[PDB]
A paper describes a structure:
To obtain sufficient iron, [name] evolved two major highly conserved iron ABC transporters, which are termed Piu (for pneumococcal iron uptake) and Pia (for pneumococcal iron acquisition) systems, respectively. Pia system is responsible for the transport of hydroxamate siderophores such as ferrichrome and ferrioxamin B, whereas Piu system for the transport of heme from hemoglobin. The overall structure of [name] is composed of an individual N-terminal and a C-terminal domain linked by an α-helix. The N- and C-terminal domains face each other to form a hydrophobic and plastic cleft.
In the complex structure, a molecule of ferrichrome is bound at the center of the inter-domain cleft, with the iron moiety sitting against the bottom of the cleft and the backbone pointing outwards. As shown in the electron density map of the complex structure, the inter-domain cleft captures a molecule of ferrichrome with Λ-cis configuration. The iron moiety of ferrichrome is pulled to the C-terminal domain via three hydrogen bonds with residues Arg231 and Tyr225. In addition, the backbone of ferrichrome is stabilized at the opening side of the inter-domain cleft via three hydrogen bonds with the side chains of Trp158 and Asn83. These six hydrogen bonds keep the ferrichrome to adopt an orientation with the iron moiety pointing inward to the binding cleft. In addition, the methylene carbon atoms of the hydroxyornithine moieties are further packed by a hydrophobic barrel. This barrel is mainly composed of four residues (Met213, Trp223, Tyr225 and Phe255) from the C-terminal domain and three residues (Trp63, Tyr84 and Trp158) from the N-terminal domain. Similar to most class III substrate-binding proteins with a relative rigid linker of α-helix, binding of ferrichrome does not trigger significant conformational changes. Upon ferrichrome binding, the Segments 1 and 2 missing in the apo-form structure undergo significant conformational changes. As a result of induced fit, residues corresponding to the two missing segments are folded into a loop and a η-helix, respectively.
Author numbering: 39 to 341
The structure:
Amino acid sequence: KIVLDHAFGQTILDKKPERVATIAWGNHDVALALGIVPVGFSKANYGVSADKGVLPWTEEKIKELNGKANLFDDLDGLNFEAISNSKPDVILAGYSGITKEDYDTLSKIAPVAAYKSKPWQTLWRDMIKIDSKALGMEKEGDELIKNTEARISKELEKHPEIKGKIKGKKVLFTMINAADTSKFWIYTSKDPRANYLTDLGLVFPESLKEFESEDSFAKEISAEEANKINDADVIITYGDDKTLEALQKDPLLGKINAIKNGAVAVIPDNTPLAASCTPTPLSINYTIEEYLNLLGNACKNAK
Ligand SMILES: [Cl-]
């Protein structure tokens, strides 16, 4: 008997689930990484064409398991009918943004593995621990974590010049709308994409604590208040070819130390690399070298 404790109470599984459905980001990759092809998982809403709806590392693993991708058409929100049609024995939502009502509705379909605290606030190691336990594979989950950690360490050790360059650099992950720079998003330390950076040797600036009290996974702040993040050595943001220059020319954002120094890592918007920034055991293997190279080049400019 599997007992799960999460934000909405307790989920009981009578035995290891035969059929596995997942929702939201990343969860399907934990299953796949453990050798399980989901009977259904959320269509990728970012990093790849909706026509395709599945990220390259996920696709690759599915093929390696001789399986096929069954996607829930749920770009606009949870598709309860589709989930129900997959006839699951468990629904992995260890990393997700489900509400009480969502949890109650899903639970009528099958036992739900929900997040521990607040929506979208599950780090990658915790994602594995929650999801792997719900699969009745807790031990395999621990092993998967150690193996993923070793993959990370291997890339860092293998490239000392990148490792030394980013080590101890104070970093913030942000989302900046090029069309409106009067405000932007900063991701909190409880967001997996912000926390992953610490696995790579970077650290959070002092100013991040100021967001410890934020209830959400990210906080939108005014450019008039951007001085707050002058303590970051390097800044990471989604964007494109024009992003850095537009930022450096911005009358308010251009004054920020890291931006002024050109210490900004621009992740190509809506690409696999962008999507990988919320890491999974599969995405890391696939993208870490590429990611480290972008991070290393940006940290080069930290003064
Ligand atoms: Cl190197």
